[PDB]
């Protein structure tokens, strides 16, 4: 439990778009709101450039959310600051809360492979998929009640499945024990959305997922480039 | 797990109708909204004609939803585009979100059989029934913890029950592992709604359903022809 | 599973009353809305008279709902038509959705005892109680994983308990497998509401209920005569 | 199951206060609303005086509710009448639904100790605590699948714990099997809120609670005297 | 069960901010609302100074809440008074309910180490984390069905893990059995938010947490100094 290394805090803020209200909003007002929001992201982009954090915006398919802002920042107070600045934009009046997840990029800190994974510049992949997950603490299947070595072996097969889908799916695991309602946030990034299906399905047939995986909601979306943001809100 | 073949992405977008608001809306405005929406579907119909996708609109009985748009498109980005275009219609101001399900038609791709099943033109049947389902990963009954051969045999009896209700119920199974909250979306199409009851009940007495089936909400509805859409929104 | 005989579709539409809004509505407008709604029910009454369906309206105690329209119609498309006509009334602007249940009166069709039970004219009893129920498919207690004969014997004791409370509680069981979220809708009708408590409690001590019963929400209400409808909405 | 004796119907109607709206309401209008509501309770007080029912109003701490009206009436139709009269008050425009529970005071009717317990004048204690409860029907722990004598012995230790906290906590158990979503409503009344913690905690270490108790939400509140009602709504 | 000592009542009132509405509110009105709210807290600060209670305000990261007022007062009626005074502020019009938890600081009363722990002046730490928790009463893992000595030993290892993270994480456990929906509220205070992750994760590998821990939602936030309140609401 002391073996896990801790990088950036990560907020997945999923919002839904109040299209009806948004349409009511005058054109010039809508335009300003997009400008306002874009300048916000421009701030975030500066942070990313300084390697002081990272973000991703994805539009989510389905009705659980419309848009996902995924923010990685060094401090949790920074996260809070970003959420608050978002929420105080015009545009955010139309971005209703949908779901959020706070978590900490988790895997000595100095080593580059660790450094990259702990302070990850989020991949600009076509699609993203997010789900929070727990390890079952239920009866016979109680991961916590497992031996370190059992758990190690369990995680060995998990690593194998993951590794098959490396170079296809980038996987950012964030631990959220004591930050949120589940234990891990798994965020997958692929240029192919089907690879998410492929990876998560294969993984379920690993004892660790089969027996110990308790999952939250899955959200998949498509990258929203910032050049595409004006368009996406055009009514 | 690598054996499943993958066709179209499928979005079931269920909405509820805000009749109260809709009535408030002036007549000519309502009329335009239906025109607007119909022209949208006309787009979708063109897509279906080009064999580049498929759709179905069904009005759902009960209060879980009012209307179900089921869209099959080759890419998930296309799905998202359709949802977004829907949501930016006037009519969609009155079509409140109710439930949605994203999934991928799942079952070499070149074969004329399987091509049909992977890229299915949705049946224009009188009724539809949708439910998402999982396989139980719970204690003794943990499908994932099952042998491939066990699972094979389990699915053998399932196929038998299905096959009895073939030529009555058309069955589109969509996998949604890593796309949505359950593992499969089952969409049934019949000219007789009772056949859904018949099929799903018989199926529950199969070990696979009896022991491994975890189900979501069931939605049943009636086909909304597009000629019937004007009428259905008439207030 | 093929042994069950199928009568009318049954919709339990439970709504809550938006009293605050309703009061805001001018008196003459409120009056019209009640007239409008009453004329609707008058339609339904004509259907009942022709033996082409049945209905009941009950005001529900508690906050889960305010009013329950229970509609039995031959086709599910008819159900949908009724729901839609309800929803497009003025009054329905104030009857917010609360809960709904679709199901099919289930128990050769020609035989009168079957005919009566399959196409039941709903009892005009003082009180009603509704709850959806499932049979547990959970571990040791998995009704579906039970032998036909076991199930038969289970249902034998159930019939005994039911039969004690016959002539007091009328019981309409509707199957909703593949129509709704549970497997059965149980609707009880008695002139004495306590008989519901009596029946459902006694039943829980039957192995079938004790071990296999998974229940939904219970709703109990009081018959709303149509002569009483004007009064009930008077503000 | 036939051994339980049945007294008054009991509605716990918990509401939340829409303070924002309430403040918007003009002063004289607010004043009238309190007058209106008070005159309602004055009706209820008359009922209590005639021994034809009982009530209690408690403001609930926390956000689950703001105010709890607990009404005991002889008939369920009377309950419904009271709820409906409440809901058609001005004040009730600001008393949003939060949670409700219907149940029947349960424990030969002629005997005074029974009579008192069946038709209980609710204690005017400083605090109240309410929670609905079930008996677990889950695997090994299935109370219904228990022998009458086992259950008897189980309830023997329960009575012991209760009896320790008698003269401190008054306990009104209402059965709601076939009236509501759980099996019992437990309402505790004490001049000391901590006695609720004391009683319910001690009780959990009784096999009956430890093994068979499934609980709903707990609500605790403070008596709202009627002379305190004007004050409590003062904005 | 009689061994636990009882200090202050504790209300965690989590609210969300209605930023959209708040922005609509004129500047001078917003300013007054902050003044109004600050003067309220100034009251609370006076209470804290008199050692007659304590509070903390934290802004919560994520969408489950925006702001957490944690109030410890000697009486539950005082708690209720504070909640009610909050709710009747202008600002509270924009502080929508999100989640609340009532509980009693639990551990002779006179002993200073007890006194401090029972009547705790809440730490002005940079971050807070709150979650309610239960002890599992489920099958084999039924804490209540455990021997006092078993439980003692269970809690021994728990104390060890806690003690490691003492001087880093301050831990206020509040019992809420018979006050709220879970059994304990755990509130952690650290200058480092990661220490929460560290503590709660390590704790999960203790038999007591691994086997007996059932957790509610976790909320983490950042201290909102009162000098920072004007700023935080600035739009």
Q: In terms of residues, how long is chain E?
A: 235
First to last CA, chain B: 50
Interior/surface letters A27-40, b for 16+ CB within 10 angstroms, e for the rest: eeebeebbeebbeb
A169: Cβ contacts below 8 Å, ≥ 6 apart: A188, A189, A190, A195, A196, A199
Which region holds residue E51: left if phi is over 0, alpha if psi is between -120 and 50, else beta? left
What tokens were used for B134? 């999982």
The residue with tokens 């306002």 is A36
Which region holds residue D15: left if phi is over 0, alpha if psi is between -120 and 50, else beta? beta
The CA distance from E53 to E8, in Å, is: 8
Mark whether E85 and E113 lie in a shared domain: yes
**Domain C-terminal end among A92, A124, A156:** A124
Q: State how far residue D197 is from chain E, nearest Cα, in angstroms.
A: 5
The CA distance from D158 to D176, in Å, is: 19
Mark whether B101 and B183 lie in a shared domain: no
The residue with tokens 């899955």 is A218
- Could you list the beta-strand ranges (E) of chain D: 6-17, 54-60, 67-73, 95-106, 127-135, 137-138, 141-142, 170-175, 184-190, 213-215, 219-223
Of B162, B84, C217, B99, residue with least CA distance to A61? B84
Chain B residue with the nearest C-alpha to that of A199: B178
D187 in Cβ contact with D12 (< 8 Å): yes
* Interchain CB distance below 8 Å, C180 and B62: yes
Mark whether D119 and D134 lie in a shared domain: no
Determine which one of B99, B127, B131, B165 is catalytic. Answer: B131
CATH code at position D27: 3.30.70.1030
Mark whether B28 and B59 lie in a shared domain: yes
Catalytic residue IDs of E: 131
**Domain C-terminal end among A89, A105, A124:** A124
Mark whether B229 and B162 lie in a shared domain: yes
The residue with tokens 């839609």 is C84
* Interchain CB distance below 8 Å, C102 and B194: no
The CA distance from E130 to E186, in Å, is: 6
What tokens were used for B161? 């029950």
Q: State how far residue B3 is from chain A, nearest Cα, in angstroms.
A: 10
Interface test with chain B among C151, C178, C179, by most B beta carbons within 10 Å: C178
Does A33 reach chain E within 8 Å, measured CB to CB? Answer: no
Does E157 reach chain A within 8 Å, measured CB to CB? Answer: no
The CA distance from D108 to A171, in Å, is: 69
Query: Could you tell me the residue range of the domain that residue D142 belongs to?
Result: 125-235
Tell me the DSSP string of D15-71: EEE-HHHHHHS-HHHHHHHHHHHHHHHHHHHHHHHTTS-EEEEEEESSSS-SEEEEE
Of C178, E190, E213, B158, residue with least CA distance to A143? E213
Q: Which of D1, D102, D144 sits opposite C62 (nearest CB)?
A: D102
Q: How many CB atoms lie within 10 A of CB D7?
A: 21
How many CA atoms, within 13 angstroms, populate the side-chain half-sphere of residue D191? 3
The CA distance from D111 to D17, in Å, is: 41
* Interchain CB distance below 8 Å, B177 and A204: yes
Instruction: State how far Cα D2 lies from the chain centre.
Output: 24
What is the enclosing helix (H) or strand (E) of A133?
strand A127-135
Resolution in A: 2.3
Interface test with chain B among A62, A162, A198, A233, by most B beta carbons within 10 Å: A62
The residue with tokens 């879970």 is E182
Name the phi and psi angles at E52, rounded to 5.
Answer: -105, 10
The CA distance from A195 to A200, in Å, is: 8
The CA distance from A89 to A98, in Å, is: 17
Mark whether C158 and C97 lie in a shared domain: no
Query: Residues 162..221 of B with a Cβ closer than 8 Å to C: which?
Result: 188, 193-194, 196-202, 204-205, 207, 209-211, 213, 217-218, 220-221
Q: How many CB atoms lie within 10 A of CB B116?
A: 11
A3 in Cβ contact with E198 (< 8 Å): no
E73 in Cβ contact with E82 (< 8 Å): yes
Does A139 reach chain B within 8 Å, measured CB to CB? Answer: yes
Does E16 reach chain A within 8 Å, measured CB to CB? Answer: yes
What is the enclosing helix (H) or strand (E) of C98?
strand C95-106
What SS3 state is found at A98? strand
Interior/surface letters E170-203, b for 16+ CB within 10 angstroms, e for the rest: bebbbbbbbbbbbbbbbbbbbeebbbbbbbbbbb
Alpha helices in B50-121 (DSSP H): 76-87, 112-118
* Interchain CB distance below 8 Å, D16 and E99: no
The CA distance from E101 to D62, in Å, is: 6
First to last CA, chain D: 50
Mark whether C227 and C175 lie in a shared domain: yes
Chain B residue with the nearest C-alpha to that of A200: B178
Residues of chain D in contact with residue C131, where contact means CB-CB under 8 angstroms, are: 178
D161: Cβ contacts below 8 Å, ≥ 6 apart: D199, D202, D203, D206
Mark whether A114 and A183 lie in a shared domain: no
Mark whether C115 and C151 lie in a shared domain: no
The CA distance from A61 to A196, in Å, is: 14
A100 in Cβ contact with E64 (< 8 Å): yes
Name the phi and psi angles at C206, rounded to 5.
Answer: -90, 140
Q: How many domains does chain A have?
A: 2
Tell me which chains share at least 3 CB pairs under 8 Å with chain E.
Answer: A, D
Mark whether B78 and B152 lie in a shared domain: no
Determine which one of A101, A127, A131, A165 is catalytic. Answer: A131
What SS3 state is found at D120? coil
**Domain C-terminal end among D59, D94, D124:** D124
DSSP H helix total and E strand total for chain A: 8, 11
Going by their DSSP bridges, the two strands D219-223 and D127-135 should be labelled as antiparallel
Tell me the DSSP string of A192-218: SSHHHHHHHHHHTTSHIIIIIEEE---
Cα dihedral sign for B197, B62, B226, C87?
positive
B183 in Cβ contact with B135 (< 8 Å): yes
Chain A residue with the nearest C-alpha to that of B95: A20
Instruction: List chain C gaps (C–N > 2.5 A) by preceding residue.
Output: 107
C172 in Cβ contact with C122 (< 8 Å): yes
* Interchain CB distance below 8 Å, E202 and A1: yes
Q: How far is CA C50 from CA C43, C81, C223, D220, in A?
A: 11, 18, 22, 53
Mark whether E1 and E108 lie in a shared domain: yes
Q: How many CB atoms lie within 10 A of CB C76?
A: 25
Does C18 reach chain B within 8 Å, measured CB to CB? Answer: no
Q: Which of E59, E194, E213 sits opposite A104 (nearest CB)?
A: E194
Mark whether C1 and C76 lie in a shared domain: yes
Q: How far is CA B91 from CA B33, B86, C119, C186, D98, in A?
A: 5, 8, 38, 37, 32
To the nearest 10°, report the CA torsion of E59, E62, E65, E68: -30
Would you call D131 a catalytic residue per the annotation? yes
Instruction: Identify the experimental approach.
Output: cryo-EM
Q: Is C214 exposed, middle or buried (0-12, 13-18, 19+ CB in 10 A)?
A: middle
D49: Cβ contacts below 8 Å, ≥ 6 apart: none
Q: For every residue of chain E, which 3-state class applies, written as one string?
A: CCCCCEEEEEEEEEEEECHHHHHHCCHHHHHHHHHHHHHHHHHHHHHHHCCCCEEEEEEECCCCCCEEEEEEECCHHHHHHHHHHHHCCHHHHHEEEEEEEEEEEECCCCCHHHHHHHCCCCCCCCEEEEEEEEECEECCEEHHHCCHHHHHHHHHHHHHHHHHCCCCCEEEEEECECCECCCEEEEEEECCCHHHHHHHHHHCCCHHHHHHEEECCCEEEEECCHHHHHHHCCC
- What number of C-beta contacts closer than 8 Å exist between A and E? 103
First to last CA, chain C: 50
What tokens were used for A126? 């076509």
């Amino acid at each position: 439990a002391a073996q896990t290394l801790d990088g950036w805090y990560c907020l997945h803020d999923f919002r839904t778009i109040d299209w009806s209200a948004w349409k009511t909003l005058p054109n010039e007002e809508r335009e300003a709101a997009i400008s306002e929001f874009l300048a916000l992201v421009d701030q975030w982009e500066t942070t990313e450039s300084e390697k002081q954090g990272s973000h991703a915006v994805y539009t989510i398919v389905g009705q659980k959310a419309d848009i996902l802002f995924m923010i990685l920042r060094p401090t949790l107070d920074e996260l809070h600051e970003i959420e608050t600045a978002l929420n105080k934009t015009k545009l955010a009046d139309y971005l209703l809360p949908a779901y959020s997840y706070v978590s900490v990029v988790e895997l000595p800190y100095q080593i580059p492979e660790v450094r990259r994974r702990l302070y990850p510049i989020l991949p600009k992949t076509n699609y993203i998929c997010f789900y929070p997950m727990d390890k079952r603490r239920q009866g016979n299947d109680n991961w916590y009640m497992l031996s370190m070595e059992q758990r190690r072996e369990l995680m060995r097969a998990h690593g194998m499945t993951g590794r098959k889908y490396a170079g296809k799916v980038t996987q950012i695991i964030t631990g959220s024990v004591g930050l949120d309602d589940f234990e891990w946030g798994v965020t997958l990034f692929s240029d192919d959305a089907l690879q998410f299906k492929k990876l998560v399905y294969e993984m379920r047939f690993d004892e660790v997922s089969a027996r110990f995986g308790e999952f939250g909601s899955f959200f998949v979306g498509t990258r929203l480039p910032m050049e595409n943001v004006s368009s996406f809100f055009h009514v």
